[PDB]
Amino acid sequence: MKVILLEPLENLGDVGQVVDVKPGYARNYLLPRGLAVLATESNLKALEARIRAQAKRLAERKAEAERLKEILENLTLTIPVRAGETKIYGSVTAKDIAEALSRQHGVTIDPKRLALEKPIKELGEYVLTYKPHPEVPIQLKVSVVAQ
Amino acid sequence: SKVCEISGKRPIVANSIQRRGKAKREGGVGKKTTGISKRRQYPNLQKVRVRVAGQEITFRVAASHIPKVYELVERAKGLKLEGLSPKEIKKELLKLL
RNA sequence: GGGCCUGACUGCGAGGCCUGCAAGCCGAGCAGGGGCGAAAGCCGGGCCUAGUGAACCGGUGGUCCCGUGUGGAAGGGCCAU
RNA sequence: UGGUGUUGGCUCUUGGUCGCGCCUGCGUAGGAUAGGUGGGAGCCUGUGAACCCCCGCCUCCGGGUGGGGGGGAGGCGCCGGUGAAAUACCACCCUGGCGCGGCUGGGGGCCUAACCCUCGGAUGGGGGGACAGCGCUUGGCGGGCAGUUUGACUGGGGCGGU
RNA sequence: CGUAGGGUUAGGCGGGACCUAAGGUGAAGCCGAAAGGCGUAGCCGAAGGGCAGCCGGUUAAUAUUCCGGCCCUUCCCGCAG
RNA sequence: GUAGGGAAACCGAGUCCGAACAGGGCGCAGCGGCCGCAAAGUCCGCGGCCGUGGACCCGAAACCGGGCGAGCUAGCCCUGGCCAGGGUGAAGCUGGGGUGAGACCCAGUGGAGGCCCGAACCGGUGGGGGAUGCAAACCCCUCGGAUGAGCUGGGGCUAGGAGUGAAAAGCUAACCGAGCCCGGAGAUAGCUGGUUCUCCCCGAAAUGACUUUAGGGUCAGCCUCAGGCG
RNA sequence: UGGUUCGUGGAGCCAUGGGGGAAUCUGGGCGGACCACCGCCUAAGGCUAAGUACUCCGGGUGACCGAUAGCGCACCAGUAC
RNA sequence: AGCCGGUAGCGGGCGUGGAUCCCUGGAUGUCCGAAUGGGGGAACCCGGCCGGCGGGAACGCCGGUCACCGCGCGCGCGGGGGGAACCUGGGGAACUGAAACAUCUCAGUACCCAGAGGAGAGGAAAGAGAAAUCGACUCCCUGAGUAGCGGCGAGCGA
Ligand SMILES: [Mg+2]
Ligand SMILES: [Mg+2]
Ligand SMILES: [Mg+2]
Ligand SMILES: [Mg+2]
Ligand SMILES: [Mg+2]
Ligand SMILES: [Mg+2]
Ligand SMILES: [Mg+2]
Ligand SMILES: [Mg+2]
Ligand SMILES: [Mg+2]
Ligand SMILES: [Mg+2]
Ligand SMILES: [Mg+2]
Ligand SMILES: [Mg+2]
Ligand SMILES: [Mg+2]
Ligand SMILES: [Mg+2]
Ligand SMILES: [Mg+2]
Ligand SMILES: [Mg+2]
Ligand SMILES: [Mg+2]
Ligand SMILES: [Mg+2]
Ligand SMILES: [Mg+2]
Ligand SMILES: [Mg+2]
Ligand SMILES: [Mg+2]
Ligand SMILES: [Mg+2]
Ligand SMILES: [Mg+2]
Ligand SMILES: [Mg+2]
Ligand SMILES: [Mg+2]
Ligand SMILES: [Mg+2]
Ligand SMILES: [Mg+2]
Ligand SMILES: [Mg+2]
Ligand SMILES: [Mg+2]
Ligand SMILES: [Mg+2]
Ligand SMILES: [Mg+2]
Ligand SMILES: [Mg+2]
Ligand SMILES: [Mg+2]
Ligand SMILES: [Mg+2]
Ligand SMILES: [Mg+2]
Ligand SMILES: [Mg+2]
Ligand SMILES: [Mg+2]
Ligand SMILES: [Mg+2]
Ligand SMILES: [Mg+2]
Ligand SMILES: [Mg+2]
Ligand SMILES: [Mg+2]
Ligand SMILES: [Mg+2]
Ligand SMILES: [Mg+2]
Ligand SMILES: [Mg+2]
Ligand SMILES: [Mg+2]
Ligand SMILES: [Mg+2]
Ligand SMILES: [Mg+2]
Ligand SMILES: [Mg+2]
Ligand SMILES: [Mg+2]
Ligand SMILES: [Mg+2]
Ligand SMILES: [Mg+2]
Ligand SMILES: [Mg+2]
Ligand SMILES: [Mg+2]
Ligand SMILES: [Mg+2]
Ligand SMILES: [Mg+2]
Ligand SMILES: [Mg+2]
Ligand SMILES: [Mg+2]
Ligand SMILES: [Mg+2]
Ligand SMILES: [Mg+2]
Ligand SMILES: [Mg+2]
Ligand SMILES: [Mg+2]
Ligand SMILES: [Mg+2]
Ligand SMILES: [Mg+2]
Ligand SMILES: [Mg+2]
Ligand SMILES: [Mg+2]
Ligand SMILES: [Mg+2]
Ligand SMILES: [Mg+2]
Ligand SMILES: [Mg+2]
Ligand SMILES: [Mg+2]
Ligand SMILES: [Mg+2]
Ligand SMILES: [Mg+2]
Ligand SMILES: [Mg+2]
Ligand SMILES: [Mg+2]
Ligand SMILES: [Mg+2]
Ligand SMILES: [Mg+2]
Ligand SMILES: [Mg+2]
Ligand SMILES: [Mg+2]
Ligand SMILES: [Mg+2]
Ligand SMILES: [Mg+2]
Ligand SMILES: [Mg+2]
Ligand SMILES: [Mg+2]
Ligand SMILES: [Mg+2]
Ligand SMILES: [Mg+2]
Ligand SMILES: [Mg+2]
Ligand SMILES: [Mg+2]
Ligand SMILES: [Mg+2]
Ligand SMILES: [Mg+2]
Ligand SMILES: [Mg+2]
Ligand SMILES: [Mg+2]
Ligand SMILES: [Mg+2]
Ligand SMILES: [Mg+2]
Ligand SMILES: [Mg+2]
Ligand SMILES: [Mg+2]
Ligand SMILES: [Mg+2]
Ligand SMILES: [Mg+2]
Ligand SMILES: [Mg+2]
Ligand SMILES: [Mg+2]
Ligand SMILES: [Mg+2]
Ligand SMILES: [Mg+2]
Ligand SMILES: [Mg+2]
Ligand SMILES: [Mg+2]
Ligand SMILES: [Mg+2]
Ligand SMILES: [Mg+2]
Ligand SMILES: [Mg+2]
Ligand SMILES: [Mg+2]
Ligand SMILES: [Mg+2]
Ligand SMILES: [Mg+2]
Ligand SMILES: [Mg+2]
Ligand SMILES: [Mg+2]
Ligand SMILES: [Mg+2]
Ligand SMILES: [Mg+2]
Ligand SMILES: [Mg+2]
Ligand SMILES: [Mg+2]
Ligand SMILES: [Mg+2]
Ligand SMILES: [Mg+2]
Ligand SMILES: [Mg+2]
Ligand SMILES: [Mg+2]
Ligand SMILES: [Mg+2]
Ligand SMILES: [Mg+2]
Ligand SMILES: [Mg+2]
Ligand SMILES: [Mg+2]
Ligand SMILES: [Mg+2]
Ligand SMILES: [Mg+2]
Ligand SMILES: [Mg+2]
Ligand SMILES: [Mg+2]
Ligand SMILES: [Mg+2]
Ligand SMILES: [Mg+2]
Ligand SMILES: [Mg+2]
Ligand SMILES: [Mg+2]
Ligand SMILES: [Mg+2]
Ligand SMILES: [Mg+2]
Ligand SMILES: [Mg+2]
Ligand SMILES: [Mg+2]
Ligand SMILES: [Mg+2]
Ligand SMILES: [Mg+2]
Ligand SMILES: [Mg+2]
Ligand SMILES: [Mg+2]
Ligand SMILES: [Mg+2]
Ligand SMILES: [Mg+2]
Ligand SMILES: [Mg+2]
Ligand SMILES: [Mg+2]
Ligand SMILES: [Mg+2]
Ligand SMILES: [Mg+2]
Ligand SMILES: [Mg+2]
Ligand SMILES: [Mg+2]
Ligand SMILES: [Mg+2]
Ligand SMILES: [Mg+2]
Ligand SMILES: [Mg+2]
Ligand SMILES: [Mg+2]
Ligand SMILES: [Mg+2]
Ligand SMILES: [Mg+2]
Ligand SMILES: [Mg+2]
Ligand SMILES: [Mg+2]
Ligand SMILES: [Mg+2]
Ligand SMILES: [Mg+2]
Ligand SMILES: [Mg+2]
Ligand SMILES: [Mg+2]
Ligand SMILES: [Mg+2]
Ligand SMILES: [Mg+2]
Ligand SMILES: [Mg+2]
Ligand SMILES: [Mg+2]
Ligand SMILES: [Mg+2]
Ligand SMILES: [Mg+2]
Ligand SMILES: [Mg+2]
Ligand SMILES: [Mg+2]
Ligand SMILES: [Mg+2]
Ligand SMILES: [Mg+2]
Ligand SMILES: [Mg+2]
Ligand SMILES: [Mg+2]
Ligand SMILES: [Mg+2]
Ligand SMILES: [Mg+2]
Ligand SMILES: [Mg+2]
Ligand SMILES: [Mg+2]
Ligand SMILES: [Mg+2]
Ligand SMILES: [Mg+2]
Ligand SMILES: [Mg+2]
Ligand SMILES: [Mg+2]
Ligand SMILES: [Mg+2]
Ligand SMILES: [Mg+2]
Ligand SMILES: [Mg+2]
Ligand SMILES: [Mg+2]
Ligand SMILES: [Mg+2]
Ligand SMILES: [Mg+2]
Ligand SMILES: [Mg+2]
Ligand SMILES: [Mg+2]
Ligand SMILES: [Mg+2]
Ligand SMILES: [Mg+2]
Ligand SMILES: [Mg+2]
Ligand SMILES: [Mg+2]
Ligand SMILES: [Mg+2]
Ligand SMILES: [Mg+2]
Ligand SMILES: [Mg+2]
Ligand SMILES: [Mg+2]
Ligand SMILES: [Mg+2]
Ligand SMILES: [Mg+2]
Ligand SMILES: [Mg+2]
Ligand SMILES: [Mg+2]
Ligand SMILES: [Mg+2]
Ligand SMILES: [Mg+2]
Ligand SMILES: [Mg+2]
Ligand SMILES: [Mg+2]
Ligand SMILES: [Mg+2]
Ligand SMILES: [Mg+2]
Ligand SMILES: [Mg+2]
Ligand SMILES: [Mg+2]
Ligand SMILES: [Mg+2]
Ligand SMILES: [Mg+2]
Ligand SMILES: [Mg+2]
Ligand SMILES: [Mg+2]
């Protein structure tokens, strides 16, 4: 008997996968514990539609990122800060870079998404990765300058 | 011993024929019937219990139509069934046949 | 008692015996292919009268007759047992 | 009472079976232990040769194969010996056997959730448990019951005889 | 016996408007080709339980039933505690 | 009906067996004067006999289906009732005795029991009577039980291959080795019985063969009718 | 297993109690085991007048009865008993 | 043009202003019965709710209403029971015949049951079966006692 798993299951298969079990097992265990469903046509359709729908929203995100690589990776973020010689008085935070990025350049971003461990404390040219999606990592070149 | 709630399979009457002798096809003189008497052949009835709409419904059904009960459960998802009695649920289910 | 042999034939069969039926019995003669005999001829088991069992069902060998739209096949008929 | 449905999970042990890894084969003769039939005139080596010793494993008592260490640039071939067939190297496939696996057949253990019992309580607990019950089918035992049969002749009938 | 006419009077006797027994029936539920068979509750079911009337008089014919005397039961309403 | 023969293919006044042009089986072939006449055959009527039906009528014991019965009787269940009077005198208990204590013995008290005698009541032993009865089981005399496995009222349950049975194949509504009613049904009866006006002609058989046959049948023999022969 | 003429037969067809178990016309069932060929037909949903059967009922008609007949009943009979 | 049933009599009435009588429709229609408020030993008994009557609260009577199951959203609709044969479906004998008897016959008959209806069933090819064919079903004649089936018996029979 073919069923569709509703969960990962010890040496049987993975969720959404279609396996063949003895009808007793399906009827008297798997189905009553909500662990699986009959591989009927009427719910094979549905599984197909779920795989369909997930894959729509995955590649749709992997575009919303990729297209956001286009808006960044083609600019430099220039941040004027009060500083002497090369060391800054205050600092440039991620929360700053994000607030900077909207004001000029237009793009709105999430500070927390940006890969900045400790607030930048020296003037110069920085190359900072964004990660708005795993597998789609972005290069934000940021020039921190004086005045 | 009785009637399939799904297929309508019911006990039927059959003869039990007793024979002695060697078939012609095997070079024997032929089969002789030493007895014919009536008997019944029953459906292979079994119980099938299922939760549908938070209630426990049970069917007495021929083994051949055991899958037909579960298919009925599937078709039942499209129904306002909650709060009915199990007699009433079973009726809605059967009505789907 | 001995020699050669397989007629302990195949296809038939005039005419009879017996007889409720069904059976049983005797059988010259013609044809085919033979045996013995120089030939006449004899040989279709045994000097004779008992040693047997109808039909049905089935087996085996043959025949190549039927073969369920057609060609086959299954299965049967027929001759022998 | 066998098979099969209702009838499921895990495990161990055996048996069949394919799918691999494999190792494996000892007549006269021929160096040596020659399974077949091709492809074959070359293959191997810092992906360290000739050979020195310790472990497994089969062992026709001669070895074979598998590991470890030095040594670390050598070894077998085609030819020729040679036998029905002859050598390195690559395959397609056998004898037997081994370990993973599929798939199974038989046994053993365990599980629970079908099914059965049970619990003032119940979409639950407890117990039995894929047995038992029940369907289809197999063969058997079966005057408990059923339908019947159980001859004729005959100095009556039986017995005897026929 | 035929024809006709009369005659059987109850809150308290008996049974019902009370209870349950065996059994019967039977929501729930179970089973069986059909008919139907079962089935805790409930219901029915008495000569068992429960419940208030004794004595006398009267008619041709009834009387614990009518009458007379002395007693009593439940139900409804009210008043009082 | 007009063609038969052959298991058949198939051939056809032939065909089958067969090598046969052999032999054989089974088949094939009107009267008168073109006219009439008769005829194959076939249709209808009538009659005899045959087959199938219940098949000439009446008769079983039985078998099967579906119902009706436990107001009789049998067992059980629920609930009530009954059992005069008399007798015997268990255990226990009390007291006396006994002993180390006891067992135990005696007395009194007590009132046991499928105990005794005997009515009601329940039976039915032996005899007599009855015998078209008073009675389809009674009567008289006698006799068994009579606190029990007792008897009995009411209310219930179990039935036909079934019940019930202290068991007799007993009883289940006056006949139970399988109840009764209706139905299958006009079961079947190779047996018994019965079979109805008249006259005229003829006129048997009781044997043989075979027969789960023997008092029943088939064939033959023997009777009779019609046609033909002579 | 039943149905059919078909009783296991060479046994198909239709139906179906058990087990197994498809496909959507390039699908399927059938023409008497089976195979090929050649054909026929479209299973697993339902309905459908009429022509057919019967006679409680009404009428018509008898080479049907005539009170032991004809219905069990001509009548107060499914009665008395 | 008579009439008040068979049915006369007593004792009273009716009808040409059309009686009796016949036909159609309506009204009334105790109780029991499927019987259905509940019970029950049919034709009796006992209730709930609304309304009415009596002096009426107890008590009683009168009218209405109250069973169960199915289907459809408490309410609607329907069911239930009967009918001589006929009909379909679910079950289904035996005597008997086979001159014994078991397969076979009787017979899918008798009979039980369910259901229908004035009929019922069947019916518009996954047919037939050899015709290059036909064209739903039913029913009659014939095909035919054929083909076949059959302890290849008795018989059965498209
Ligand atoms: Mg059988
Ligand atoms: Mg055979
Ligand atoms: Mg053969
Ligand atoms: Mg046979
Ligand atoms: Mg189950
Ligand atoms: Mg099946
Ligand atoms: Mg299955
Ligand atoms: Mg010679
Ligand atoms: Mg002769
Ligand atoms: Mg003769
Ligand atoms: Mg010669
Ligand atoms: Mg010669
Ligand atoms: Mg010579
Ligand atoms: Mg001669
Ligand atoms: Mg001699
Ligand atoms: Mg001799
Ligand atoms: Mg002879
Ligand atoms: Mg015979
Ligand atoms: Mg014979
Ligand atoms: Mg033969
Ligand atoms: Mg053919
Ligand atoms: Mg031929
Ligand atoms: Mg064919
Ligand atoms: Mg060919
Ligand atoms: Mg041919
Ligand atoms: Mg061939
Ligand atoms: Mg042949
Ligand atoms: Mg042959
Ligand atoms: Mg012969
Ligand atoms: Mg078995
Ligand atoms: Mg099993
Ligand atoms: Mg365990
Ligand atoms: Mg457990
Ligand atoms: Mg459990
Ligand atoms: Mg255990
Ligand atoms: Mg089991
Ligand atoms: Mg079961
Ligand atoms: Mg089997
Ligand atoms: Mg058996
Ligand atoms: Mg016997
Ligand atoms: Mg025996
Ligand atoms: Mg007996
Ligand atoms: Mg008999
Ligand atoms: Mg015998
Ligand atoms: Mg005998
Ligand atoms: Mg005798
Ligand atoms: Mg004698
Ligand atoms: Mg004699
Ligand atoms: Mg004599
Ligand atoms: Mg004598
Ligand atoms: Mg004598
Ligand atoms: Mg003898
Ligand atoms: Mg008087
Ligand atoms: Mg008074
Ligand atoms: Mg009252
Ligand atoms: Mg009462
Ligand atoms: Mg009560
Ligand atoms: Mg009952
Ligand atoms: Mg009860
Ligand atoms: Mg009450
Ligand atoms: Mg009382
Ligand atoms: Mg009382
Ligand atoms: Mg009272
Ligand atoms: Mg009283
Ligand atoms: Mg008083
Ligand atoms: Mg008096
Ligand atoms: Mg009086
Ligand atoms: Mg008074
Ligand atoms: Mg007050
Ligand atoms: Mg000739
Ligand atoms: Mg003429
Ligand atoms: Mg004529
Ligand atoms: Mg005759
Ligand atoms: Mg007849
Ligand atoms: Mg007759
Ligand atoms: Mg006759
Ligand atoms: Mg008779
Ligand atoms: Mg009798
Ligand atoms: Mg008998
Ligand atoms: Mg009997
Ligand atoms: Mg009977
Ligand atoms: Mg009976
Ligand atoms: Mg009694
Ligand atoms: Mg009695
Ligand atoms: Mg009592
Ligand atoms: Mg007494
Ligand atoms: Mg006494
Ligand atoms: Mg006394
Ligand atoms: Mg005492
Ligand atoms: Mg003392
Ligand atoms: Mg004393
Ligand atoms: Mg005393
Ligand atoms: Mg005493
Ligand atoms: Mg006594
Ligand atoms: Mg006594
Ligand atoms: Mg006395
Ligand atoms: Mg007294
Ligand atoms: Mg008495
Ligand atoms: Mg007695
Ligand atoms: Mg006496
Ligand atoms: Mg005496
Ligand atoms: Mg006497
Ligand atoms: Mg006497
Ligand atoms: Mg006497
Ligand atoms: Mg007498
Ligand atoms: Mg006396
Ligand atoms: Mg006495
Ligand atoms: Mg006495
Ligand atoms: Mg005495
Ligand atoms: Mg006594
Ligand atoms: Mg006494
Ligand atoms: Mg006494
Ligand atoms: Mg006594
Ligand atoms: Mg007692
Ligand atoms: Mg008593
Ligand atoms: Mg009593
Ligand atoms: Mg009584
Ligand atoms: Mg009694
Ligand atoms: Mg009893
Ligand atoms: Mg009874
Ligand atoms: Mg009865
Ligand atoms: Mg009986
Ligand atoms: Mg008995
Ligand atoms: Mg007794
Ligand atoms: Mg009687
Ligand atoms: Mg009797
Ligand atoms: Mg009696
Ligand atoms: Mg008697
Ligand atoms: Mg009997
Ligand atoms: Mg009997
Ligand atoms: Mg009847
Ligand atoms: Mg009959
Ligand atoms: Mg008859
Ligand atoms: Mg007889
Ligand atoms: Mg007799
Ligand atoms: Mg006569
Ligand atoms: Mg004379
Ligand atoms: Mg004789
Ligand atoms: Mg004979
Ligand atoms: Mg004989
Ligand atoms: Mg004989
Ligand atoms: Mg006889
Ligand atoms: Mg004769
Ligand atoms: Mg003569
Ligand atoms: Mg004659
Ligand atoms: Mg003459
Ligand atoms: Mg089949
Ligand atoms: Mg059949
Ligand atoms: Mg045959
Ligand atoms: Mg067939
Ligand atoms: Mg099936
Ligand atoms: Mg096709
Ligand atoms: Mg296809
Ligand atoms: Mg088909
Ligand atoms: Mg087929
Ligand atoms: Mg076919
Ligand atoms: Mg066809
Ligand atoms: Mg067709
Ligand atoms: Mg229809
Ligand atoms: Mg029309
Ligand atoms: Mg019609
Ligand atoms: Mg008519
Ligand atoms: Mg009429
Ligand atoms: Mg007349
Ligand atoms: Mg008369
Ligand atoms: Mg009469
Ligand atoms: Mg007269
Ligand atoms: Mg009449
Ligand atoms: Mg009469
Ligand atoms: Mg009369
Ligand atoms: Mg009368
Ligand atoms: Mg009058
Ligand atoms: Mg007057
Ligand atoms: Mg007058
Ligand atoms: Mg007028
Ligand atoms: Mg009217
Ligand atoms: Mg009134
Ligand atoms: Mg009424
Ligand atoms: Mg009522
Ligand atoms: Mg009622
Ligand atoms: Mg009322
Ligand atoms: Mg009121
Ligand atoms: Mg007043
Ligand atoms: Mg009032
Ligand atoms: Mg009222
Ligand atoms: Mg009905
Ligand atoms: Mg009706
Ligand atoms: Mg039928
Ligand atoms: Mg039915
Ligand atoms: Mg049937
Ligand atoms: Mg029966
Ligand atoms: Mg019979
Ligand atoms: Mg008969
Ligand atoms: Mg006969
Ligand atoms: Mg017979
Ligand atoms: Mg006979
Ligand atoms: Mg006999
Ligand atoms: Mg018989
Ligand atoms: Mg007959
Ligand atoms: Mg039949
Ligand atoms: Mg029938
Ligand atoms: Mg009839
Ligand atoms: Mg009806
Ligand atoms: Mg009509
Ligand atoms: Mg119609
Ligand atoms: Mg219709
Ligand atoms: Mg159509
Ligand atoms: Mg013809
Ligand atoms: Mg028949």
PDB file of N, CA and C (backbone and C1' of nucleotides) in Angstrom, chain D residues 26-30 34 82-85:
ATOM      1  P     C D  26      41.208 -29.185  -8.310  1.00  0.00           P
ATOM      2  O5'   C D  26      42.798 -29.016  -8.492  1.00  0.00           O
ATOM      3  C5'   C D  26      43.414 -28.858  -9.781  1.00  0.00           C
ATOM      4  C4'   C D  26      44.837 -29.379  -9.794  1.00  0.00           C
ATOM      5  C3'   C D  26      44.968 -30.844  -9.384  1.00  0.00           C
ATOM      6  O3'   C D  26      45.995 -31.493 -10.164  1.00  0.00           O
ATOM      7  C1'   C D  26      46.160 -29.466  -7.830  1.00  0.00           C
ATOM      8  P     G D  27      45.626 -32.225 -11.584  1.00  0.00           P
ATOM      9  O5'   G D  27      46.413 -33.634 -11.509  1.00  0.00           O
ATOM     10  C5'   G D  27      45.787 -34.841 -11.051  1.00  0.00           C
ATOM     11  C4'   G D  27      46.017 -35.989 -12.010  1.00  0.00           C
ATOM     12  C3'   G D  27      47.242 -35.857 -12.927  1.00  0.00           C
ATOM     13  O3'   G D  27      48.529 -36.068 -12.304  1.00  0.00           O
ATOM     14  C1'   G D  27      45.362 -36.492 -14.236  1.00  0.00           C
ATOM     15  P     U D  28      49.912 -35.490 -12.976  1.00  0.00           P
ATOM     16  O5'   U D  28      50.154 -36.528 -14.170  1.00  0.00           O
ATOM     17  C5'   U D  28      50.180 -37.934 -13.906  1.00  0.00           C
ATOM     18  C4'   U D  28      50.405 -38.740 -15.162  1.00  0.00           C
ATOM     19  C3'   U D  28      51.518 -38.201 -16.047  1.00  0.00           C
ATOM     20  O3'   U D  28      52.840 -38.437 -15.566  1.00  0.00           O
ATOM     21  C1'   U D  28      49.638 -38.649 -17.400  1.00  0.00           C
ATOM     22  P     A D  29      53.745 -37.173 -15.075  1.00  0.00           P
ATOM     23  O5'   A D  29      53.749 -36.153 -16.306  1.00  0.00           O
ATOM     24  C5'   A D  29      54.200 -36.570 -17.589  1.00  0.00           C
ATOM     25  C4'   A D  29      53.942 -35.535 -18.662  1.00  0.00           C
ATOM     26  C3'   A D  29      54.519 -34.147 -18.397  1.00  0.00           C
ATOM     27  O3'   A D  29      55.937 -34.026 -18.519  1.00  0.00           O
ATOM     28  C1'   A D  29      52.322 -33.900 -19.179  1.00  0.00           C
ATOM     29  P     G D  30      56.792 -33.354 -17.300  1.00  0.00           P
ATOM     30  O5'   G D  30      56.810 -31.776 -17.630  1.00  0.00           O
ATOM     31  C5'   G D  30      57.028 -31.271 -18.951  1.00  0.00           C
ATOM     32  C4'   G D  30      56.128 -30.088 -19.228  1.00  0.00           C
ATOM     33  C3'   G D  30      56.261 -28.898 -18.277  1.00  0.00           C
ATOM     34  O3'   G D  30      57.338 -28.028 -18.592  1.00  0.00           O
ATOM     35  C1'   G D  30      53.985 -29.508 -18.392  1.00  0.00           C
ATOM     36  P     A D  34      48.328 -27.168 -12.212  1.00  0.00           P
ATOM     37  O5'   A D  34      48.158 -25.906 -13.218  1.00  0.00           O
ATOM     38  C5'   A D  34      47.933 -24.541 -12.793  1.00  0.00           C
ATOM     39  C4'   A D  34      46.914 -23.808 -13.673  1.00  0.00           C
ATOM     40  C3'   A D  34      45.475 -24.400 -13.731  1.00  0.00           C
ATOM     41  O3'   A D  34      44.455 -23.362 -13.880  1.00  0.00           O
ATOM     42  C1'   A D  34      46.471 -24.489 -15.908  1.00  0.00           C
ATOM     43  P     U D  82      58.567 -30.056 -25.111  1.00  0.00           P
ATOM     44  O5'   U D  82      57.096 -30.274 -24.495  1.00  0.00           O
ATOM     45  C5'   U D  82      56.869 -30.574 -23.119  1.00  0.00           C
ATOM     46  C4'   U D  82      55.697 -29.778 -22.570  1.00  0.00           C
ATOM     47  C3'   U D  82      54.333 -30.001 -23.228  1.00  0.00           C
ATOM     48  O3'   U D  82      53.685 -31.210 -22.823  1.00  0.00           O
ATOM     49  C1'   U D  82      54.684 -27.666 -22.862  1.00  0.00           C
ATOM     50  P     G D  83      53.618 -32.484 -23.824  1.00  0.00           P
ATOM     51  O5'   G D  83      52.102 -33.028 -23.727  1.00  0.00           O
ATOM     52  C5'   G D  83      51.513 -33.488 -22.506  1.00  0.00           C
ATOM     53  C4'   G D  83      50.334 -32.626 -22.084  1.00  0.00           C
ATOM     54  C3'   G D  83      49.153 -32.603 -23.058  1.00  0.00           C
ATOM     55  O3'   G D  83      48.266 -33.717 -22.931  1.00  0.00           O
ATOM     56  C1'   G D  83      49.731 -30.376 -22.505  1.00  0.00           C
ATOM     57  P     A D  84      47.472 -34.284 -24.234  1.00  0.00           P
ATOM     58  O5'   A D  84      46.679 -33.026 -24.862  1.00  0.00           O
ATOM     59  C5'   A D  84      46.227 -33.038 -26.225  1.00  0.00           C
ATOM     60  C4'   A D  84      44.995 -32.173 -26.444  1.00  0.00           C
ATOM     61  C3'   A D  84      45.107 -30.685 -26.066  1.00  0.00           C
ATOM     62  O3'   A D  84      45.674 -29.831 -27.056  1.00  0.00           O
ATOM     63  C1'   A D  84      43.196 -31.603 -25.026  1.00  0.00           C
ATOM     64  P     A D  85      47.012 -28.978 -26.712  1.00  0.00           P
ATOM     65  O5'   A D  85      46.473 -27.486 -26.387  1.00  0.00           O
ATOM     66  C5'   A D  85      45.263 -26.941 -26.933  1.00  0.00           C
ATOM     67  C4'   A D  85      44.442 -26.217 -25.872  1.00  0.00           C
ATOM     68  C3'   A D  85      45.208 -25.191 -25.020  1.00  0.00           C
ATOM     69  O3'   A D  85      45.326 -23.892 -25.608  1.00  0.00           O
ATOM     70  C1'   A D  85      43.939 -26.606 -23.593  1.00  0.00           C
TER      71        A D  85
END
